[PDB]
Amino acid sequence: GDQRFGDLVFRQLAPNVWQHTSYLDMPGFGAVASNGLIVRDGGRVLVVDTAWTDDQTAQILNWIKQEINLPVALAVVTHAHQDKMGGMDALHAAGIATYANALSNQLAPQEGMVAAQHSLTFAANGWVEPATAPNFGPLKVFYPGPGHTSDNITVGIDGTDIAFGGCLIKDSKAKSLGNLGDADTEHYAASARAFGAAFPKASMIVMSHSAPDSRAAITHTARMADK
Ligand SMILES: C[C@H](CS)C(=O)N1CCCCC[C@@H]1C(=O)O
Ligand SMILES: [Zn+2]
Numbered sequence: 001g002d003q004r005f006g007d008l009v010f011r012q013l014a015p016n017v018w019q020h021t022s023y024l025d026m027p028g029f030g031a032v033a034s035n036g037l038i039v040r041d042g043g044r045v046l047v048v049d050t051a052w053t054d055d056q057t058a059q060i061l062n063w064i065k066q067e068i069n070l071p072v073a074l075a076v077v078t079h080a081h082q083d084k085m086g087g088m089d090a091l092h093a094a095g096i097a098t099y100a101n102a103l104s105n106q107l108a109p110q111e112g113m114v115a116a117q118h119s120l121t122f123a124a125n126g127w128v129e130p131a132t133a134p135n136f137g138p139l140k141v142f143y144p145g146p147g148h149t150s151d152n153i154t155v156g157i158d159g160t161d162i163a164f165g166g167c168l169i170k171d172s173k174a175k176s177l178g179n180l181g182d183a184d185t186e187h188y189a190a191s192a193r194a195f196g197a198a199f200p201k202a203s204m205i206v207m208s209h210s211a212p213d214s215r216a217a218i219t220h221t222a223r224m225a226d227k
């Protein structure tokens with residue numbers, strides 16, 4: 001299943017969907033995996049999240065060229081931390097249009113990230129304002145509320161059973177939500193449940209720091225945020 005391509009790993013999840021995985025030695029935590037997505041929509045490719053670094057992100061684009069060989073129309077990144085936004089400059093160097101929550105772009109400089117070119121804004125109910133996500137094809141973008149960070153967003157893939165929780169969701173047997181340094185501890189639990197309710201038919205939950213899991217990942221995350 002897994003395909004090793006340099007120091008990255010790619011796994012097909014559905015006919016038009018792949019998970020990209022990249023690793024960063026975080027002193028004190030080991031070599032930490034981070035997952036994002038690659039989606040083919042007809043004659044173009046859409047990317048969810050960068051890798052940790054520009055070099056790794058360029059390797060994602062090289063893998064796309066080899067395995068899909070269609071242009072990358074856009075990328076959307078799911079919050080202003082390095083695992084999701086660390087490779088922005090590589091996307092820009094490649095000419096790819098980039099999108100993030102407006103709040104992620106606001107936070108990017110202080111978090112050490114390069115901002116995306118375009119800002120997404122969200123309705124009161126959490127769904128992206130459609131004019132801010134033009135030409136997103138099957139990507140359905142949802143702001144569940146503050147949790148892992150104030151800016152975290154999530155993405156469903158229409159035509160599949162897949163929803164991507166990014167760093168908000170941990171798998172059903174995880175033991176910790178992380179260090180919570182940037183987390184909204186008051187609202188985290190509600191935000192996790194809101195993600196599940198926004199994508200109620202998704203049976204494959206993809207997330208940044210666990211392999212894909214069933215919907216049990218959402219309720220386990222939500223219970224731990226209760227603490
Ligand atoms: C870099 C990354 C951005 S989500 C990060 O800070 N993490 C996630 C990796 C391992 C856990 C530590 C910390 C956390 O979530 O507590
Ligand atoms: Zn994060």
Ligand SMILES: [Zn+2]
Nearest residue numbers: 081083167208
């Ligand atoms: Zn993360």
